[PDB]
Amino acid sequence: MKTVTVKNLIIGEGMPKIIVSLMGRDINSVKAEALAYREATFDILEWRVDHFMDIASTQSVLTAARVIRDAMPDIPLLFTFRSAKEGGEQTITTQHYLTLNRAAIDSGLVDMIDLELFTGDADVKATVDYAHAHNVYVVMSNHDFHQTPSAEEMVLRLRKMQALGADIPKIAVMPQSKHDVLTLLTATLEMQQHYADRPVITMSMAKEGVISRLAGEVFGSAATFGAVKQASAPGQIAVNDLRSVLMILHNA
Amino acid sequence: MKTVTVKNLIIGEGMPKIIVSLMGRDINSVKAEALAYREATFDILEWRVDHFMDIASTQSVLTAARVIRDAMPDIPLLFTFRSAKEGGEQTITTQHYLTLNRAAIDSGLVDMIDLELFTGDADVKATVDYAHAHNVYVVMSNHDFHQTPSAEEMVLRLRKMQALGADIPKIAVMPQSKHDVLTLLTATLEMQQHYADRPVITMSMAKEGVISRLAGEVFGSAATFGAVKQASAPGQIAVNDLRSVLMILHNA
Ligand SMILES: *[C@@]1(O)C[C@@H](C(=O)O)C[C@@H](O)[C@@H]1O
Numbered sequence: 001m002k003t004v005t006v007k008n009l010i011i012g013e014g015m016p017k018i019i020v021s022l023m024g025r026d027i028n029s030v031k032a033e034a035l036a037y038r039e040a041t042f043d044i045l046e047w048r049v050d051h052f053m054d055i056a057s058t059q060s061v062l063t064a065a066r067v068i069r070d071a072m073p074d075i076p077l078l079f080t081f082r083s084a085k086e087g088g089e090q091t092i093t094t095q096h097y098l099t100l101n102r103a104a105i106d107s108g109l110v111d112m113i114d115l116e117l118f119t120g121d122a123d124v125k126a127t128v129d130y131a132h133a134h135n136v137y138v139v140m141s142n143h144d145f146h147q148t149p150s151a152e153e154m155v156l157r158l159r160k161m162q163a164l165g166a167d168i169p170k171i172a173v174m175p176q177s178k179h180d181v182l183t184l185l186t187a188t189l190e191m192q193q194h195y196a197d198r199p200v201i202t203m204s205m206a207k208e209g210v211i212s213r214l215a216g217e218v219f220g221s222a223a224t225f226g227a228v229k230q231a232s233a234p235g236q237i238a239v240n241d242l243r244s245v246l247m248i249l250h251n252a
Numbered sequence: 253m254k255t256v257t258v259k260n261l262i263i264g265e266g267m268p269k270i271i272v273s274l275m276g277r278d279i280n281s282v283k284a285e286a287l288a289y290r291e292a293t294f295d296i297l298e299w300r301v302d303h304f305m306d307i308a309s310t311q312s313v314l315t316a317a318r319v320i321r322d323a324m325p326d327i328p329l330l331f332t333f334r335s336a337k338e339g340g341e342q343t344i345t346t347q348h349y350l351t352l353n354r355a356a357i358d359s360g361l362v363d364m365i366d367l368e369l370f371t372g373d374a375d376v377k378a379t380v381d382y383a384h385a386h387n388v389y390v391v392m393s394n395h396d397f398h399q400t401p402s403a404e405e406m407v408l409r410l411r412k413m414q415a416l417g418a419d420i421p422k423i424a425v426m427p428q429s430k431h432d433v434l435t436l437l438t439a440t441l442e443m444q445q446h447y448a449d450r451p452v453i454t455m456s457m458a459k460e461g462v463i464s465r466l467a468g469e470v471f472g473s474a475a476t477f478g479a480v481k482q483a484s485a486p487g488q489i490a491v492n493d494l495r496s497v498l499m500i501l502h503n504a
């Protein structure tokens with residue numbers, strides 16, 4: 001296991017780390033959210049850039065990043081543009097997606113970026129290399145908002161992210177049955193027991209999948225997402241309740 | 253599904269019901285525990301009769317039952333002699349075990365009894381019939397403190413309890429790996445999806461199995477055990493923490 005340490009937070013040891021997502025459509029909204037969010041207790045701040053409407057302007061995006069970092073100078077900050085293809089709010093070109101991510105890396109304002117595995121292997125690998133050259137870690141991600149692949153498929157997908165240089169592979173899948181929630185936990189455990197080179201983040205979405213957001217410590221998900229006021233994906237619960245549960249499990 | 257209603261508690265609907273176990277070695281200890289326990293919040297009181305040292309005297313046992321019922325007149329009360337064979341504190345003859353259980357049934361003091369499946373089919377069936385004739389429900393139970401059977405084996409075991417007249421089949425198994433915890437959840441879910449005639453109580457014991465004590469509502473365990481001060485089996489957590497988690501899951 002190669003853990004990932006950002007600002008004295010160690011991802012891949014101990015209790016799963018709590019991530020919340022900041023979703024602001026504009027600069028004033030981001031400012032207000034950053035001020036509210038700094039009164040919540042959590043480990044990593046994810047900025048969901050795809051909710052930001054002025055995405056065409058790299059400098060507008062960087063100005064918003066700076067608002068966030070100034071509000072919270074000591075928080076690990078993950079920059080995530082979630083494409084609509086994978087359940088986010090809007091669509092941009094692959095070239096603009098890579099530009100925004102490289103700009104984020106160059107800014108020194110963010111500690112981690114999210115790169116979607118299915119952006120394409122060559123582009124992902126080159127951007128991973130860029131991030132690493134600039135001391136930024138990569139959460140490499142995949143989402144299936146329709147269904148849950150087989151456990152074997154999910155393991156192979158996470159392994160491929162590892163092969164491409166991901167610091168932290170991530171997969172989120174939509175259950176169509178309670179059995180699908182167990183499949184996701186099965187794949188998670190298989191990584192912990194047999195492919196434990198990198199911390200992984202896994203979740204089964206929606207109400208049915210909520211237990212996957214709580215059981216990270218036993219089956220091997222290194223982080224989990226909670227909601228401050230609004231969920232950034234189906235199934236997230238209130239961040240304070242998430243924290244209560246994690247602590248009870250850790251101390252059981 | 254045929255639910256079981258005891259004193260306006262419906263077992264097999266809604267949130268899993270919280271059971272705590274009273275373990276007193278003697279009459280004064282039982283008295284003190286009943287007084288402390290009535291200041292805890294839970295749904296069903298289990299009296300672990302096997303911790304009671306004066307087990308040879310049916311009347312001593314009935315006197316202790318009455319202490320409990322007087323302290324808590326409105327609580328569902330489950331009378332459980334757990335044999336040492338299945339992880340309890342002492343051993344008695346099969347005939348004395350059946351005598352104590354029939355005495356409990358006859359007393360009108362208890363709402364439910366526990367009968368161990370492996371006492372023997374004919375004796376179990378006859379005692380189930382006796383309980384039913386006297387308006388007492390049966391939790392039929394099995395414990396494996398060494399290992400976890402296969403999911404198929406656990407389902408067949410629970411189905412056999414149903415066939416013998418159990419109102420509520422119960423199985424507790426010891427994980428030797430995290431995979432074994434998923435096996436127990438798998439068997440639980442199979443009952444909910446395919447053999448949903450009776451509420452079932454399931455658990456994977458020990459620290460590793462704790463998630464099974466929390467996830468009853470999604471995968472289909474109708475009750476879960478918490479500790480007031482001391483656990484009555486490995487893996488139980490503090491009853492207040494158990495309740496916090498159940499409520500968060502129910503409302504997620
Ligand atoms: C990630 O895709 C996980 C999501 C979830 O909680 O299912 C939340 C997203 O904001 C995050 O990027």
Ligand SMILES: *[C@@]1(O)C[C@@H](C(=O)O)C[C@@H](O)[C@@H]1O
Binds near residue numbers: 334477
């Ligand atoms: C049952 O055997 C379940 C046990 C557990 O919590 O694993 C507790 C016992 O007291 C009860 O009878």
